[PDB]
Ligand SMILES: [Fe+3]
Ligand SMILES: [Fe+3]
Ligand SMILES: [Fe+3]
Ligand SMILES: [Fe+3]
Ligand SMILES: [Fe+3]
Ligand SMILES: [Fe+3]
Ligand SMILES: [Fe+3]
Ligand SMILES: [Fe+3]
Ligand SMILES: [Fe+3]
Ligand SMILES: [Fe+3]
Ligand SMILES: [Fe+3]
């Protein structure tokens with residue numbers, strides 16, 4: 001035996017006490033190890049957060065794709081963001097199953113559909129909405145991370161940091177920069193031009 | 204003038220009576236022409252049908268992706284079907300905007316999450332569920348088509364026939380054939396083998 | 407014999423009663439079958455509609471190609487639209503002969519030549535004119551389709567739906583989006599910039 | 610000076626107090642910095658854990674490579690797992706030397722050699738054994754991580770998370786899925802078929 005900063009290390013002897021950690025009933029995960037209910041439930045929450053964000057971005061896409069709005073760069077940007085939030089949800093679903101939890105998909109609420117806001121202009125308002133949405137997803141990611149830290153699940157904390165937190169802060173800066181640019185160019189010709197550059201970036 | 208089977212043809216003279224059909228208020232679609240509220244609402248219904256079907260297939264994927272179920276071909280099949288139903292929804296959203304209607308995304312209900320059914324076996328039960336889901340989407344597509352026929356919207360009927368109905372009957376035969384094969388191979392080794400062939404088809 | 411929803415199916419026996427349906431006089435179409443006078447006349451109307459639309463677009467091209475107007479993207483756009491409307495006319499002429507009708511080209515009226523409209527600006531006014539023209543062609547296409555439905559000519563209805571109606575609604579959305587963009591960018595630098603993007607799209 | 614959440618930041622001035630942190634005796638590591646004895650000892654434990662796991666997998670390989678067992682896919686799977694556990698040990702040895710600790714290789718115990726288990730069947734029993742072994746290695750990795758957290762060694766925690774924990778949970782799901790599949794296919798033809806698919810995966 002070895003005790004290292006209070007942590008007991010039992011030496012390697014045999015694989016048999018762990019054979020009891022091989023479940024013998026077919027409805028139970030065999031992979032699950034040190035993956036507690038709180039972390040399972042917090043992953044399920046973040047799946048519903050990302051999916052709802054995907055749906056919200058699809059609603060934004062549907063508005064700017066209107067012929068009388070005609071901001072194709074915005075529409076494509078919001079469509080791709082919807083695809084991305086859904087990929088996040090899917091990656092979290094795969095992770096849940098990798099750790100042996102159960103994915104529990106919840107309801108998705110009606111999102112906002114109209115983004116007609118003449119004072120700021122539709123484009124600036126919607127990009128600010130997108131920024132707020134990303135910050136909301138980031139808050140939930142931080143909640144998820146706090147659960148994982150409290151449960152001493154270091155594989156989960158690293159998963160969240162490496163797979164989601166870094167992309168999240170990069171998405172927020174990018175959209176923040178879009179808001180700043182839209183404020184600088186102003187409504188009308190400036191917005192249209194920004195939209196054309198968005199369309200070119202989106203290839 | 205020419206009246207042909209009761210249909211009045213006025214000869215081509217000038218483009219001015221149609222300039223009044225160019226809306227001058229910015230919140231109204233300029234494209235909209237002979238696209239009535241019933242067709243707009245029926246497209247919105249089919250968008251919600253396809254999206255709910257996408258969500259249901261994602262829930263199916265999440266179950267078969269479990270380590271204790273371990274039917275990777277099924278999981279991938281259901282994941283791809285979820286992607287496909289979402290693409291259908293998106294194509295219908297694009298169409299709505301092409302015709303000048305408004306996309307109205309509605310709520311998505313909690314789907315079924317557990318497909319543990321020992322008598323039929325999980326694989327056969329889920330493939331039968333998928334078949335029932337496709338038939339449900341086909342019924343809604345037929346409702347949508349009946350609205351378009353009643354409203355004399357021939358571009359919409361052709362759109363529905365060419366873009367969705369043909370794929371729909373092809374999907375149903377494919378999944379029907381999967382059900383038939385799963386019944387023939389039986390539970391256990393047969394199901395696993397069918398799953399391996401599904402995985403190979405899915406590249 | 408078989409009667410199916412009221413439709414009499416006589417079984418296949420021989421090809422001789424149809425030899426009388428092989429005309430023996432050289433001025434008559436041998437191909438013509440279930441292609442009635444109303445459909446022949448409605449196709450001839452749509453040929454004259456598309457040709458007049460071609461001529462109108464050529465007049466628009468001739469205005470924006472002026473050195474003091476100098477909107478080359480618009481000029482090229484209207485030139486290509488003129489080519490396209492003429493191709494539609496030609497495709498309808500080919501179809502008329504495929505079905506065994508007679509093409510009857512009618513007169514083309516003097517179109518509008520001056521599009522100097524300072525309040526909206528030449529570019530916005532002309533794009534709205536183009537939108538109205540496309541909607542006028544779409545109305546005639548719907549008249550043509552209604553004749554074909556009433557005459558129970560399903561090959562013709564499908565021809566109209568597949569070859570013209572889908573392109574027509576796509577052209578209308580595209581031009582509607584152009585109108586919306588021109589309103590957003592405003593006269594002067596915005597219009598010129600929109601024109602430059604039109605020129606780039608037109609390769 | 611700057612104190613930030615209690616953490617003292619002394620400003621950059623010169624490199625001389627750290628020249629005393631350059632050891633002048635040849636038997637001492639010059640690299641070692643903030644790498645305490647508990648972390649050094651915990652790395653040495655995990656090296657012995659991975660090596661023992663390598664040896665156990667080699668014993669498994671040696672059994673299934675027998676002509677009367679003849680499960681070549683299993684034999685190759687266990688051989689490659691043995692190579693992988695040894696690579697883990699080696700990577701941990703390299704890390705120990707990177708941080709300036711001393712690698713201390715310990716004894717390796719006789720592993721189990723016979724895996725003749727007729728009730729479950731040799732293949733299912735051995736795959737469950739492998740699962741238990743991976744879970745045992747994961748427990749030790751968690752012990753190692755807890756030592757590093759307690760000693761505030763963030764480079765070590767990240768090393769463990771990025772290099773080992775993620776692969777570990779992926780290995781466990783993969784082997785869990787193998788157990789589930791072996792249970793589904795059953796002994797005899799099913800096991801042989803699973804073995805053939807294992808052999809194909811292993812290229
Ligand atoms: Fe546990
Ligand atoms: Fe637990
Ligand atoms: Fe795309
Ligand atoms: Fe993914
Ligand atoms: Fe659970
Ligand atoms: Fe559940
Ligand atoms: Fe509105
Ligand atoms: Fe935290
Ligand atoms: Fe990282
Ligand atoms: Fe990183
Ligand atoms: Fe950018």
Ligand SMILES: [Fe+3]
Pocket residue numbers: 189190
């Ligand atoms: Fe400007």
Ligand SMILES: [Fe+3]
Pocket residue numbers: 193196197
């Ligand atoms: Fe540009």
Ligand SMILES: [Fe+3]
Pocket residue numbers: 197198
């Ligand atoms: Fe930019």
Ligand SMILES: [Fe+3]
Pocket residue numbers: 235236237238
């Ligand atoms: Fe109308």
Ligand SMILES: [Fe+3]
Pocket residue numbers: 238239240
């Ligand atoms: Fe209407």
Ligand SMILES: [Fe+3]
Pocket residue numbers: none
């Ligand atoms: Fe894929």
Ligand SMILES: [Fe+3]
Pocket residue numbers: 290293294297
């Ligand atoms: Fe699409």
Ligand SMILES: [Fe+3]
Pocket residue numbers: 243304305
């Ligand atoms: Fe509406």
Ligand SMILES: [Fe+3]
Pocket residue numbers: 113114305307
């Ligand atoms: Fe609305």
Ligand SMILES: [Fe+3]
Pocket residue numbers: 027317318319
């Ligand atoms: Fe269950």
Ligand SMILES: [Fe+3]
Pocket residue numbers: 348349352
């Ligand atoms: Fe119908």
Ligand SMILES: [Fe+3]
Pocket residue numbers: 361364365568
């Ligand atoms: Fe078709």
Ligand SMILES: [Fe+3]
Pocket residue numbers: 364365369
């Ligand atoms: Fe077809």
Ligand SMILES: [Fe+3]
Pocket residue numbers: 377404
């Ligand atoms: Fe197939």
Ligand SMILES: [Fe+3]
Pocket residue numbers: 392393
């Ligand atoms: Fe069998």
Ligand SMILES: [Fe+3]
Pocket residue numbers: 396399400
């Ligand atoms: Fe196979």
